[PDB]
Design a protein around this ligand. Structure first.
Ligand SMILES: [K+]
Ligand SMILES: [K+]
Ligand SMILES: [K+]
Ligand SMILES: [Mg+2]
Ligand SMILES: [Mg+2]
Ligand SMILES: [Mg+2]
Ligand SMILES: [Mg+2]
Ligand SMILES: [Mg+2]
Ligand SMILES: [Mg+2]
Ligand SMILES: [Mg+2]
Ligand SMILES: [Mg+2]
Ligand SMILES: [Mg+2]
Ligand SMILES: [Mg+2]
Ligand SMILES: [Mg+2]
Ligand SMILES: [Mg+2]
Ligand SMILES: [Mg+2]
Ligand SMILES: [Mg+2]
Ligand SMILES: [Mg+2]
Ligand SMILES: [Mg+2]
Ligand SMILES: [Mg+2]
Ligand SMILES: [Mg+2]
Ligand SMILES: [Mg+2]
Ligand SMILES: [Mg+2]
Ligand SMILES: [Mg+2]
Ligand SMILES: [Mg+2]
Lengths: 123, 129, 82, 205, 155, 80
RNA sequence: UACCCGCAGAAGAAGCACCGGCUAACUCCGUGCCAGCAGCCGCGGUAAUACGGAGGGUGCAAGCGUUAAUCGGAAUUACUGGGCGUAAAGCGCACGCAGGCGGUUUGUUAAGUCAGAUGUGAAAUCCCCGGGCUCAACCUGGGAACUGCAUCUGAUACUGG
RNA sequence: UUAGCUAGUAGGUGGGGUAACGGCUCACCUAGGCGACGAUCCCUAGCUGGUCUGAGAGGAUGACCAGCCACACUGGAACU
């Protein structure tokens, strides 16, 4: 408050930390699936939600969500991950990008296709 | 302890006029006489007087219009903890020029309007609305 | 040594040249001591395609500056027109 | 670059004549102008203030035919120019070569005028120009080039423009197929139906 | 004559032995332009009834402000509860740079050119209070001169 | 006409040399309070004539030692 | 090469994301806390404008979304511009060094302060007024600015000595 | 959640050395010098004109272009 106190000790600017530290300010990262499994969400929801533990190229290991109906992922499968948490899955801070490396696009989807990695129906 | 007798004078004005006092009395001082003179010239007070030889008192007669204080506000700006000086090109305009700032220029205590006309800066004592 | 020369300051296929005084060791577009004028090869006939401060050029030559062949040509051109 | 869909749906959504068709016939014989498009368009909404501002921004773009990027560039320049940002913006939109060509009467529609420009049929100040966004300026002459005067289109367009209100800032000599900026346009002459200040509000947020 | 604005509608509730009773409140403002404005806060069990009460309250409870040919005389700071409002005059063609709750008040007052900023609580009721308080404090050269006894040439 | 500083002697224990404190008031860049700032110079003190607390006038010269690059012009006041 | 002329024929050239609220756009059919969705609030357990499909919108456009990252909004580190009875915040109390601050009067100085002059503050970039590319983006002439630094010559109200 | 650091270290006299002033270097003499206005130590980092953001004060930043600095497989040295 008092200007003499400020001169003795300036205003310490807070630092806002990144929510996605394993991404190291990269937009995406490659990684290898060491385990693929499912978990219940927390209240109020109920489901079995599909997740994988992935070792990233920088040696971080993270848990990542596998969006869309059905997937082809397996252990030793190589996938690309991006930021964005899932809420109701505590600790799942990343999304697997569909349609990149081993991760197939969703097979029969026709709307919002570019989010799920599936190509135009030509006919 | 008392360390800013100018802020003391201004606070006595503010409080006395909020209390509808007819006149207020305070310890006199050259700078107080100068500031009171400027306020009288700008019409913010009716009159001022100095009385006594060893311990001179200064009295200000306060001014009211339609039953309400003529002084709208009176605010110390330069103060012992943080002195404020302005260049000619930086003198502030109080209430877009309806109020006054009191500036101790090298030529003496005067309004900011006078200081701009003279082409001077100085120490800015207070704002009066 | 001190030299007076053109610096290419324009766009692709749209050249424009400043006339600048420089130490010859400095890069074409790099450090220069003083700017002296300009030349435009594609200015209109209605347009000022060249300007020089001939007085300061004479001053620098008095100091021993080396004029570039194209700058010399431009000076002859200006003193033929003017 | 261009909107190429059903033009009169736009007028239905705006609920007003956007001049998108040349006017050989009244639009109520060509569309259910009073009713918004689609199966739910019968249920008239209660627009929010954001909806209102958006709808005006859309209306002005959709009259003059300008996409958002170019329209925002017009906004930024009008905000740089002196005077009222909205009056400046409308003066800019009215200074376009396609708009001038339409006001002059050589195109029966703004899109027809845009073809006439783009196909190098228009000359300005004695020079061919085919850029729709070209900003015409005072004392500029505009004319049909002499190879193009053979088209029937321009003749029918002139026989329609004679029915429309005559602009005050232009002059045209229809029989010669030439005209001129006598003045720049002004807020007095452009239709009061455009709420320029809502455009200013929407981009100034 | 009067222009009218509806600023807000809010559903409040009273708990009772049987459950919850829901009631609607409406905040509105009216003004002549030309620097006369008032605000009205109405309560009812029906939205239109609340609005009508608000308007009737706002036709009385109406104050005069000495506008400077459609702008403010000087910058003003108004405060009420948690809401602090700064307003400043602006050059012609500036328009109303303000938030919705302040824009309504300044529009119905007819202040065409203003810069304004809300600080602290943006709660519409207290914001309207703070804005009216500020406009009510604003004063003009002629009555400043009358107070100080100078001629207006003092400006 | 010499561009010159004035300060006070804060050490005299070196040979032909003194430490001079220059004391300056400077407006703090951000908070605007006027802060006292100090700078210490090592100054050539020929004859060892100065003493602690003296007020002395000094000027910039050629390098004279590792630290010394300033020389005494004159004493202006003396302590005690 | 730019630019210009001639010729055939609408011929060779439109996608992406949204539509529960914030925030413009909604109705059927699947499905039944499942499968799935999400920036925040939050949707789905047999009548889902929130999932998936279709028909309608709406918004951008040779682009459209998503992830990463900075400032803003954030007066949420508050110098301009915040707080400390109960929301986070007065040391358990006191003494006291360095430090910050200083009742009143006269003289003197001219450090802070103020005024004037001179030098410097590279060009570019950024603003204003004008030129050139068929417009624009680009290029370019002149001006302003470069919120500063430094050295002289004055003023002495205030502050410091 | 680094408080003490330094012995060519700080200064002086006289030789030597440099294009040149100097502990730059050497013999001897004095015993200092720096530091809470943060020395020493640890982590990070080329600097500036500027760029982005902002009503402004500020905050972040130093890709392209221009000025200065440093480097040239790693570590030393000198020659012309
Ligand atoms: K503060
Ligand atoms: K020696
Ligand atoms: K040494
Ligand atoms: Mg449940
Ligand atoms: Mg484009
Ligand atoms: Mg708040
Ligand atoms: Mg939604
Ligand atoms: Mg259903
Ligand atoms: Mg922020
Ligand atoms: Mg801030
Ligand atoms: Mg707080
Ligand atoms: Mg408690
Ligand atoms: Mg507490
Ligand atoms: Mg206590
Ligand atoms: Mg005590
Ligand atoms: Mg003490
Ligand atoms: Mg003390
Ligand atoms: Mg005193
Ligand atoms: Mg001085
Ligand atoms: Mg050598
Ligand atoms: Mg590095
Ligand atoms: Mg801000
Ligand atoms: Mg800016
Ligand atoms: Mg590089
Ligand atoms: Mg290598």
């Amino acid at each position: 408050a008092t200007v003499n106190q400020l001169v003795r000790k300036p205003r310490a600017r807070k630092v806002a930390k990144s929510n996605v530290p394993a991404l190291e300010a990269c937009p995406q990262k490659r990684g290898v699936c060491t385990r693929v499994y499912t978990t219940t969400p927390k209240k109020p929801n109920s489901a079995l939600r599909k997740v994988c533990r992935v070792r990233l190229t920088n040696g971080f290991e993270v848990t990542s969500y596998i969006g869309g109906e059905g997937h082809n992922l397996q252990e030793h499968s190589v996938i690309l991950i991006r930021g964005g948490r899932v809420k109701d899955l505590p600790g799942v801070r990343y999304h697997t990008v569909r349609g990149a490396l081993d991760c197939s696009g969703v097979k029969d989807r026709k709307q919002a296709r570019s989010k799920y990695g599936v190509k135009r129906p030509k006919a | 302890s008392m360390q800013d007798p100018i802020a003391d004078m201004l606070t006595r004005i503010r409080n006395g006029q909020a209390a509808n006092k007819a006149a207020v009395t305070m310890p006199s001082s050259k700078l107080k006489v100068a500031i009171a003179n400027v306020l009288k010239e700008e019409g913010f007070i009716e009159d001022f007087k100095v009385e006594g030889d060893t311990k001179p008192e200064l009295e200000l007669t306060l001014k009211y219009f339609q039953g309400k204080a003529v002084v709208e506000s009176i605010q110390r700006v330069s103060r012992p903890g943080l002195r404020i000086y302005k260049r000619k090109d930086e003198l502030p305009k109080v209430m877009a020029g309806l109020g006054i700032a009191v500036v101790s220029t090298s030529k003496g205590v005067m309004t900011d309007r006078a200081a701009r006309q003279a082409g001077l800066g100085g120490e800015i004592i207070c704002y009066v609305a | 040594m001190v030299t007076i020369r053109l610096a290419r300051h324009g766009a692709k296929k749209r050249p424009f040249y400043q006339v600048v005084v420089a130490d010859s060791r400095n890069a074409r577009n790099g450090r220069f001591i003083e700017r002296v004028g300009f030349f435009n090869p594609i200015a209109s006939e209605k347009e000022e395609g060249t300007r020089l401060d001939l007085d300061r050029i004479a001053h620098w030559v008095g100091q021993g500056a080396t004029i570039s062949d194209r700058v010399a040509a431009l000076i002859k051109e200006v003193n033929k027109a003017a | 670059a261009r909107y190429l869909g059903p033009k009169l749906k736009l007028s239905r959504r705006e609920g007003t004549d956007l001049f998108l068709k040349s006017g050989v016939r009244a639009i109520d014989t060509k569309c259910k102008i009073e009713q918004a498009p689609g199966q739910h368009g019968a249920r008239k909404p209660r627009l929010s203030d954001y909806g209102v501002q958006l709808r005006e921004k859309q209306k002005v773009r959709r009259i003059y035919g300008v996409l958002e990027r170019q329209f925002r560039n017009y906004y930024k320049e009008a905000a740089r120019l002196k005077g009222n940002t909205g009056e400046n913006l409308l003066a800019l939109l009215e200074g376009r070569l396609d708009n001038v060509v339409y006001r002059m009467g050589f195109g029966a529609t703004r899109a027809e005028a845009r073809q006439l420009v783009s196909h190098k049929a228009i000359m300005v100040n004695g020079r061919v120009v085919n850029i729709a966004s070209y900003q015409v300026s005072p004392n500029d002459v505009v004319s049909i080039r002499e190879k193009a005067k053979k088209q029937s289109r321009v003749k029918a367009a002139l026989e329609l423009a004679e029915q429309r209100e005559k602009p005050t800032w232009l002059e045209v000599d229809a029989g010669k197929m030439e005209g001129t900026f006598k003045r720049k346009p002004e807020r007095s002459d452009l239709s009061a139906d455009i709420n320029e200040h809502l455009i200013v509000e929407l981009y100034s947020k | 004559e009067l222009q009218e604005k509806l600023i807000a509608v809010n559903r409040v509730s009273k708990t009772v032995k049987g459950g919850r009773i829901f009631s609607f409140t409406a905040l509105t403002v009216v003004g002549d332009g030309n620097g006369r404005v008032g605000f009205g806060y109405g309560k009812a069990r029906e939205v239109p009834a609340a609005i009508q009460k608000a308007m009737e309250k706002a036709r009385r409870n109406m104050i005069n402000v000495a506008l400077n040919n459609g702008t403010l005389q000087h910058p003003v700071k108004g405060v009420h509860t948690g809401s602090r409002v700064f307003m400043q005059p602006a050059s012609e063609g500036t328009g109303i740079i303000a938030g919705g709750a302040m824009r309504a008040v300044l529009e119905v007052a007819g202040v065409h050119n203003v810069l304004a900023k809300a600080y602290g609580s943006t709660n519409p009721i207290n914001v309207v209070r703070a804005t009216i308080d500020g406009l009510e404090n604003m004063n003009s050269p002629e009555m400043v001169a009358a107070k100080r006894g100078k001629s207006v040439e003092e400006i | 006409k010499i561009r010159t500083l004035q300060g006070r002697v804060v050490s005299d224990k070196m040979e032909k040399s003194i430490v001079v404190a220059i004391e300056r008031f400077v407006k703090h860049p951000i908070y605007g309070k006027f802060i006292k700032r100090t700078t210490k110079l090592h100054v050539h003190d020929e004859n060892n004539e100065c003493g602690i607390g003296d007020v002395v006038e000094i000027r910039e010269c050629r390098p004279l030692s590792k630290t010394k690059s300033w020389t005494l012009v004159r004493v202006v006041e003396k302590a005690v």
